[PDB]
Design an enzyme around this catalytic site. Structure first.
Site, PDB file in Angstrom:
ATOM      1  N   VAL A  26      -0.732  -3.869 -33.134  1.00 25.80           N
ATOM      2  CA  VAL A  26       0.081  -3.182 -34.129  1.00 25.80           C
ATOM      3  C   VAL A  26      -0.721  -2.450 -35.193  1.00 25.80           C
ATOM      4  O   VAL A  26      -0.146  -1.859 -36.099  1.00 25.80           O
ATOM      5  CB  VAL A  26       1.039  -4.171 -34.823  1.00 25.80           C
ATOM      6  CG1 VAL A  26       0.290  -4.950 -35.884  1.00 25.80           C
ATOM      7  CG2 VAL A  26       2.237  -3.430 -35.403  1.00 25.80           C
ATOM      8  N   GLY A  27      -2.041  -2.494 -35.099  1.00 22.85           N
ATOM      9  CA  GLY A  27      -2.831  -1.790 -36.085  1.00 22.85           C
ATOM     10  C   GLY A  27      -4.278  -2.201 -36.209  1.00 22.85           C
ATOM     11  O   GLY A  27      -4.859  -2.838 -35.329  1.00 22.85           O
ATOM     12  N   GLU A  71      -8.872  -6.353 -35.845  1.00 20.44           N
ATOM     13  CA  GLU A  71      -7.794  -5.787 -35.044  1.00 20.44           C
ATOM     14  C   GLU A  71      -6.579  -6.680 -35.266  1.00 20.44           C
ATOM     15  O   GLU A  71      -6.699  -7.905 -35.335  1.00 20.44           O
ATOM     16  CB  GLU A  71      -8.179  -5.727 -33.558  1.00 20.44           C
ATOM     17  CG  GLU A  71      -7.330  -4.717 -32.767  1.00 20.44           C
ATOM     18  CD  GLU A  71      -7.960  -4.269 -31.442  1.00 20.44           C
ATOM     19  OE1 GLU A  71      -9.159  -3.903 -31.432  1.00 20.44           O
ATOM     20  OE2 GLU A  71      -7.246  -4.258 -30.415  1.00 20.44           O
ATOM     21  N   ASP A  92      -9.418  -3.995 -53.060  1.00 19.12           N
ATOM     22  CA  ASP A  92      -9.120  -3.096 -51.955  1.00 19.12           C
ATOM     23  C   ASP A  92      -7.648  -2.679 -51.929  1.00 19.12           C
ATOM     24  O   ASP A  92      -7.051  -2.478 -50.869  1.00 19.12           O
ATOM     25  CB  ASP A  92      -9.515  -3.732 -50.622  1.00 19.12           C
ATOM     26  CG  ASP A  92      -9.563  -2.724 -49.501  1.00 19.12           C
ATOM     27  OD1 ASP A  92     -10.080  -1.621 -49.755  1.00 19.12           O
ATOM     28  OD2 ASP A  92      -9.091  -3.031 -48.384  1.00 19.12           O
TER      29      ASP A  92
HETATM   30  C1  LIG Z   1      -5.472 -10.187 -44.207  1.00 24.48           C
HETATM   31  C2  LIG Z   1      -4.394  -9.406 -43.522  1.00 24.48           C
HETATM   32  C3  LIG Z   1      -3.107 -10.027 -43.498  1.00 24.48           C
HETATM   33  C4  LIG Z   1      -2.015  -9.369 -42.855  1.00 24.48           C
HETATM   34  O1  LIG Z   1      -0.767 -10.049 -42.867  1.00 24.48           O
HETATM   35  C5  LIG Z   1      -2.161  -8.073 -42.242  1.00 24.48           C
HETATM   36  C6  LIG Z   1      -3.472  -7.431 -42.254  1.00 24.48           C
HETATM   37  C7  LIG Z   1      -4.585  -8.103 -42.911  1.00 24.48           C
HETATM   38  C8  LIG Z   1      -3.659  -6.037 -41.607  1.00 24.48           C
HETATM   39  O2  LIG Z   1      -4.755  -5.485 -41.624  1.00 24.48           O
HETATM   40  C9  LIG Z   1      -2.449  -5.354 -40.932  1.00 24.48           C
HETATM   41  C10 LIG Z   1      -2.589  -4.061 -40.323  1.00 24.48           C
HETATM   42  C11 LIG Z   1      -1.460  -3.420 -39.704  1.00 24.48           C
HETATM   43  O3  LIG Z   1      -1.652  -2.166 -39.132  1.00 24.48           O
HETATM   44  C12 LIG Z   1      -0.178  -4.046 -39.671  1.00 24.48           C
HETATM   45  C13 LIG Z   1      -0.005  -5.335 -40.267  1.00 24.48           C
HETATM   46  O4  LIG Z   1       1.283  -5.859 -40.183  1.00 24.48           O
HETATM   47  C14 LIG Z   1      -1.140  -6.008 -40.909  1.00 24.48           C
HETATM   48  C15 LIG Z   1      -0.959  -7.396 -41.558  1.00 24.48           C
HETATM   49  O5  LIG Z   1       0.140  -7.936 -41.540  1.00 24.48           O
END
Ligand SMILES: Cc1cc(O)c2c(c1)C(=O)c1cc(O)cc(O)c1C2=O
EC number: 2.7.11.1
Length: 329
Positions: free
Chosen positions: A40-41, A47, A151
């Protein structure tokens, strides 16, 4: 030469077991308990995928760290454990071991994720006040707990426009604040870097997150993200100097007796100040209000000590209506 105007003695008054993330021992979980269900991202050196569960069988989030030092992993986990519960902060559920290779994985809660590249442009004047407010609640909390996020940016502020919910994520750069400590300035993202990071004033503090917040806010009300479109750390300071004016920067550099390196001072040259109102234009008139500008203006101050604090900001007349809704519910 600088200290935090608030929550400075938080970690100085708490048990070493609180901020000494090194002397931590991870009580890992069973990898077996979680399974990837759809990427998802990406989360800066990590990742991320939407996963499932141990026995609940509910949506969650799996963030497979990008193998960095054992040092930073304890840090992120520890900080997340300290902030678990605070208003709008991401909640850590597990911390399994490396199924695959080189790293462990942090399990969070499902954050229905939405996009700031398409979301933001649809946000109404009130939606903003509401979310910036909710984000503030999250910042005043971690700050109250002696932790700097370092950040803050649109990406780490996941909103569920449907559930009117907001969560602050990625505490991988976060850190505990200690009076007079000189931290590294290679933190946060360039467009949200506070001037302190750009002049190399290492003894910064919570007020760093407030500058980043200011950058997001501006990009929101003026509809121009990123607002400080710098091409590198040096051009980031210029891109800023060209808006806040060099007079402000000079007073700043003297106050903290910091000397701007050659090559940097030249690239900054000298520029007058640009009135916030000069950034107004059709697409952003329905958001730029005198109250917004005033709030923004108190966030984007060279002098970190001059910036509003998370707590102060939440009482600003700009969020007056958002507040008048919680004392009524
Ligand atoms: C420490 C941390 C906690 C998170 O709950 C997420 C992320 C990092 C995160 O990088 C992230 C990226 C994304 O593209 C979708 C998410 O739902 C996420 C996240 O939900």
């Amino acid at each position: 030469m600088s200290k935090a105007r608030v929550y400075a003695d938080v970690n100085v008054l708490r048990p070493k077991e609180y901020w000494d993330y090194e002397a931590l021992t991870v009580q890992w979980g069973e990898q077996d308990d979680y399974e990837v269900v759809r990427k998802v991202g990406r989360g800066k050196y990590s990742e991320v995928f939407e996963g499932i569960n141990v026995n609940n069988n509910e949506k969650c989030i799996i963030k497979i760290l990008k193998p960095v030092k054992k040092k930073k992993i304890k840090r992120e986990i520890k900080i997340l454990q300290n902030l678990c519960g605070g208003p709008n902060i991401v909640k850590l559920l597990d911390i399994v071991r490396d199924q695959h290779s080189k790293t462990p994985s942090l399990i969070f809660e499902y954050v229905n994720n939405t996009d700031f590249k398409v979301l933001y442009p649809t946000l109404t004047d009130y939606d903003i006040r509401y979310y910036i407010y909710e984000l503030l609640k999250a910042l005043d909390y971690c700050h109250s707990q002696g932790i700097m996020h370092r950040d803050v940016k649109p990406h780490n502020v996941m909103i569920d426009h449907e559930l009117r919910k907001l969560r602050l994520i990625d505490w991988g750069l976060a850190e505990f604040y200690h009076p007079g400590k000189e931290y590294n300035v290679r933190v946060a993202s360039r467009y949200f870097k506070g001037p302190e990071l750009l002049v190399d004033l290492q003894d910064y503090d919570y007020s760093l997150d407030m500058w980043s917040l200011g950058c997001m806010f501006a990009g929101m009300i003026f509809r121009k993200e990123p607002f400080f479109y710098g091409h590198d750390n040096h051009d980031q300071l210029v891109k800023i100097a060209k808006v806040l004016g060099t007079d402000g920067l000079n007073v700043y550099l003297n106050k903290y007796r910091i000397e701007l390196d050659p090559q940097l001072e030249a690239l900054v040259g000298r520029h007058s100040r640009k009135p916030w109102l000069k950034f107004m234009n059709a697409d952003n008139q329905h958001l730029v209000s005198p109250e917004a500008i005033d709030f923004l203006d108190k966030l984007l101050r060279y002098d970190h000590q001059e910036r509003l604090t998370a707590l102060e900001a939440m009482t600003h007349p700009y969020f007056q209506q958002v507040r008048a809704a919680e004392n009524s519910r």
